[PDB]
């Protein structure tokens, strides 16, 4: 029937309002935000050419670093930063093709579908070796905004990444299944994280990159040992706030 | 004593959707308080129900959120939307954006039309929903043969039209390679019943905003990933 | 692929499985629910068009 969209809200009707019909609803709860985001989606990739028993040193090789920033939003080395930082845009890895892969790391499924302005959750991370050669790797998890501690080994022939009280994982051997998974709690000093844009600066002289919030991540993962590893994120107890537009899709 | 175990044939497999958790490596940590927050929502369906804009074609093939009507009654529909959450006309509505991440839908669809012409402009439209089987309606005579509502302009500016869920199956696909009887469900066409009528000093063309959203009993199910594309 | 050197098939929220390594037993198994929009499936013939 008639209404007035200028009110900013109109009723949700079913066929019975204007016609001789009945409501036809069936129970369904797979649209719940928690359920939807509670599944693992590819969100990053990591590569290392250093052995386990050596000093970890930040490196990049064809757009792959040996450490990542834990955030569904695009991240990459920004203006020669030592470690990857959150990006404000996505770029093709290739300077010519104008087709993906992108040089930036992110959870494509999150970027392409995040109809909210802020989110809150714990993060379940899965790290998988891209081939079947027996794994021998050490990973260090650094909480949001904590010291990276990219120091020298304090003892000969030991993985510098394991030289910490920070949570770290060590998998190696013929009995392992070439992967690692674990869940970390939300560690940002922010109450909720911005899911798309942050309309401001991060420091007091407003000289940072406008659009990026301060400490808006889940920490970092540093890796040593040989191999290329893919990473997945799974959002536990996910909560979202303030509905907002989704990424635009080209007209068919 | 140790427990005997039978290692299943899928040892070491990483299931991206297993309904189970993994090992907590930094527990006993407080999640930074956010009790002051507002605007939280828990169901993606909430989004589907917010009316957002349909993309209509310009005379220059440019996309606009409305269609034109004037002092005449064309023998053809002013606009035609195929009922599919795949329709290109609704490709950028929140409804379609959410539906792209689910396999099936069920329930009502609400097509909202907002008359933006002058207050001195009057007229009547016939909004029709034609179920499939006999093709698209070619005339007003045919369009009236199906589900329809007559929209009369006046004090109230908009008309909330519902495309009833009429289907051979309980659920319908949100997308498809080729149209099937389970993924394409007919057409919504709006006709000019009486011409837009008005006094002198009033522009001949009136613009009617067009929006879509899920109705009261609308639902989606089966989380999936849509065909990827390069933004541009 | 949206990112270099990653399995494009895993670049989805759709259910996917990844098995690799010396500790695995070269197989995968899982159960999926009935997902067709049809109430029941035709087991042999379907006397019609789609």
């Amino acid at each position: 029937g008639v209404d007035n969209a200028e009110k900013g809200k109109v009723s949700d009707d079913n066929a019975s309002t204007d016609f001789v019909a009945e409501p036809v609803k069936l129970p369904e709860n797979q649209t719940r935000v928690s359920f939807f985001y509670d599944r693992s989606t590819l969100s990053s990739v990591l590569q290392s050419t250093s052995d386990v028993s050596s000093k970890f040193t930040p490196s990049t090789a064809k757009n792959l670093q040996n450490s990542i920033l834990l955030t569904p939003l695009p991240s990459d080395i920004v203006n020669n930063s030592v470690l990857p930082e959150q990006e404000r845009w996505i770029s093709f890895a290739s300077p010519t093709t104008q087709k993906p892969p992108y040089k930036t790391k992110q959870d494509w499924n999150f970027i392409m579908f995040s109809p909210f302005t802020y989110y809150k959750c714990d993060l379940e991370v899965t790290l998988s070796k891209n081939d079947r050669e027996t794994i021998s790797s050490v990973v260090r998890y650094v909480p949001c905004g904590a010291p990276s501690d990219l120091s020298d080994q304090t003892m000969p022939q030991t993985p510098s990444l394991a030289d910490t009280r920070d949570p770290h994982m060590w998998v190696v051997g013929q009995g392992t299944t070439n992967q690692i998974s674990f869940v970390i709690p939300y560690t940002s000093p922010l109450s909720v994280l911005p899911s798309v844009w942050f309309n401001g600066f991060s420091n007091f002289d407003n000289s940072s990159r406008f659009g990026v919030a301060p400490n808006a991540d889940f920490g970092r993962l540093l890796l040593q040992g040989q191999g290329t590893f893919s990473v997945h994120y799974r959002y536990k107890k996910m909560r979202v706030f303030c509905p907002r537009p989704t990424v635009f899709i080209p007209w068919p | 004593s140790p427990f005997p175990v039978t290692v299943r044939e899928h040892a070491g497999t990483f299931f991206s959707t297993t309904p189970d958790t993994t090992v907590p490596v930094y527990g006993n940590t407080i999640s930074t308080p956010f009790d002051y927050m507002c605007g939280e929502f828990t169901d993606l369906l909430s989004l589907c129900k917010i009316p957002t804009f349909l993309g209509n074609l310009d005379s220059n093939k440019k996309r606009i959120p409305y269609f034109s009507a004037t002092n005449s009654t064309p023998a053809t529909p002013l606009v035609t939307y195929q009922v599919t959450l795949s329709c290109s006309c609704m490709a950028n509505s929140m409804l379609a954006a959410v539906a792209r991440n689910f396999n099936q839908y069920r329930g009502s669809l609400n097509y909202l039309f907002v008359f933006t012409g002058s207050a001195m402009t009057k007229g009547k439209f016939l909004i029709s929903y034609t179920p499939p089987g006999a093709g698209e309606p070619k005339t007003l005579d045919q369009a009236m043969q199906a589900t329809y509502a007559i929209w009369d302009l006046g004090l109230n500016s908009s008309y909330n039209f519902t495309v009833p869920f009429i289907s051979p199956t309980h659920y319908r696909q949100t997308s498809y390679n080729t149209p099937t009887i389970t993924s394409v469900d007919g057409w919504l066409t709006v006709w000019q019943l009486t011409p837009l009528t008005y006094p002198l000093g009033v522009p001949n063309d009136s613009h009617i905003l067009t929006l879509v959203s899920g109705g009261d009993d609308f639902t989606l199910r089966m989380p999936v990933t849509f065909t990827k594309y390069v933004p541009q | 692929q949206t990112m270099p050197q990653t399995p494009s098939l895993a670049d989805t929220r759709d259910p996917h499985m990844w098995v690799v390594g010396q500790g695995t037993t070269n197989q995968i198994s899982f159960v999926i629910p009935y997902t067709s929009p049809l109430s029941v499936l035709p087991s042999v013939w379907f006397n019609g068009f789609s």
């Binding site: 069936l26 129970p27 | 309904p19 189970d20 309980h170 | 159960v31 629910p33 009935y34």
Partner: peptide, 24 residues
Amino acid sequence: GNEGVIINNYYSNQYQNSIDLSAN
């Protein structure tokens, strides 16, 4: 048929099996 384990299924019934529902 063909299930003969005495301890209850580890995954809840909603998840282990599709949910049967009547539309009427």
